[PDB]
């Protein structure tokens, strides 16, 4: 398993889709964004 | 009985207390292992043969999810004397999954009406699912007409790399756009929170995180309160490697001794389901044990300074549970290149 990290202070925000347990994560795709 | 599983069966019977967990989490199971001795006379077959594709979890884990569904069990499993031996005990495994030897699983043959070896089509067709109608051989880099597709072990096969990671897992917009965060795994959604903070227990607010213990009360914590995590789960057949999530600058890499078998205190006693599509407690439990399990903290300056520090946290799973980072602190990664891998082992 793994956790990414995001301070309240960063800009960028998780990509909704992924929010909903069970989404697929390609590798290398974006999870959060500005 | 190989010396480590000596030790840890000494170990068992070296405090009257650790002993009667060993035996209370046994109570009623009828199937094999049904008591310690078994379990260690099992452990000793596992760890002499590389997992074979079939089952819903790794070996270990599979003859442990009932014992891990007890108070005693998940007691045992909380103590750090215990899980030293358990750390030592898949340190073992591993080497042999290391060894020329283990290859012998990567093959196509079918092993019973359950199991099958790794090079079947099956577990082929099985592990290229989301690649999107790419074969084996195109995607991941290996032989297909070599003896074990070319692979020299077990764990290299488990640690297969991407043979053209810009057809199949691009770096999307491009290790240019410093304004995007890439996926660090291969993996599904398992977890998404909001304004995260710190408890001083781990007790009745089970699958909340607890920064402190999470990232092991590192300094760096209290930039990360108030902040948001996203967690991922890597099916048993994903790719296993680590991509660096941004461009930046490794700040910290921290590794952090654990558990192995701890599930969550809620899901203790629920239903183990005999199928696939149901979750069973401890796949229920990532986000409680990621604040307990055997980890690696990797703390990442974005060359994008509004994106700034994150962190990485590497969470092992039973007998998954040995992060090796490829890269050193104060090292400059660009997103998309090697941070490391998970292995077999403690």
Not at chain 1, 4 to 20: H, P, Q, Y
Not at chain 2, 112 to 139: I, Q, T
Not at chain 2, 158 to 165: A, H, L, S
Not at chain 2, 210 to 227: I, V
Request: aromatic letters at 12%.
């Amino acid at each position: 398993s793994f956790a990414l990290g995001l301070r309240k202070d960063c800009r960028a925000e998780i990509v909704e889709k992924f929010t909903e347990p069970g989404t697929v994560i390609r590798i290398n795709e974006v999870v959060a964004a500005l | 009985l190989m010396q480590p599983i000596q030790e840890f069966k000494a170990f068992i019977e070296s405090d009257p207390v650790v002993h009667q967990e060993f035996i209370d989490m046994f109570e009623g199971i009828q199937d094999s292992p049904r008591n310690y001795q078994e379990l260690c006379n099992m452990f000793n077959d596992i760890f002499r043969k590389a997992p074979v594709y079939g089952d819903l979890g790794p070996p270990v884990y599979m003859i442990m999810a009932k014992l891990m569904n007890t108070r005693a069990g998940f007691s045992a499993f909380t103590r750090q004397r215990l899980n030293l031996h358990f750390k030592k005990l898949f340190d073992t495994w591993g080497l042999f999954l290391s060894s020329k030897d283990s290859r012998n699983v990567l093959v196509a043959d079918q092993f019973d009406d359950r199991h099958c070896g790794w090079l079947n089509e099956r577990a082929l067709s099985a592990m290229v699912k989301h690649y999107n109608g790419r074969a084996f051989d195109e995607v991941f880099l290996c032989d297909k007409n070599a003896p074990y597709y070319g692979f020299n072990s077990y764990d290299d096969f488990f640690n297969r790399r991407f043979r053209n990671r810009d057809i199949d897992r691009p770096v999307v917009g491009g290790v240019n756009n410093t304004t995007l965060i890439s996926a660090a795994c291969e993996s599904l959604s398992y977890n998404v929170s909001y304004d995260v903070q710190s408890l001083d227990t781990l007790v009745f607010k089970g699958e909340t995180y607890s920064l402190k213990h999470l990232l092991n009360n590192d300094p760096f914590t209290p930039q990360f309160e108030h902040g948001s995590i996203l967690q991922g789960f890597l099916n048993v057949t994903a790719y296993h490697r680590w991509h660096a999530p941004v461009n930046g600058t490794i700040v910290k890499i921290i590794n952090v001794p654990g558990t192995y078998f701890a599930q969550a205190p809620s899901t203790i006693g629920d239903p183990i389901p005999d199928n696939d599509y149901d979750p069973p407690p401890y796949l229920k439990s990532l986000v409680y044990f990621s604040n307990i399990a055997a980890r690696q903290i990797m703390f990442i300056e974005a060359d994008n300074k509004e994106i700034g520090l994150i962190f990485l946290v590497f969470i092992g799973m039973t007998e998954i549970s040995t992060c090796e980072a490829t890269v050193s602190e104060g090292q400059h990664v660009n997103r998309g290149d090697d941070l490391g891998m998970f292995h077999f082992g403690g």
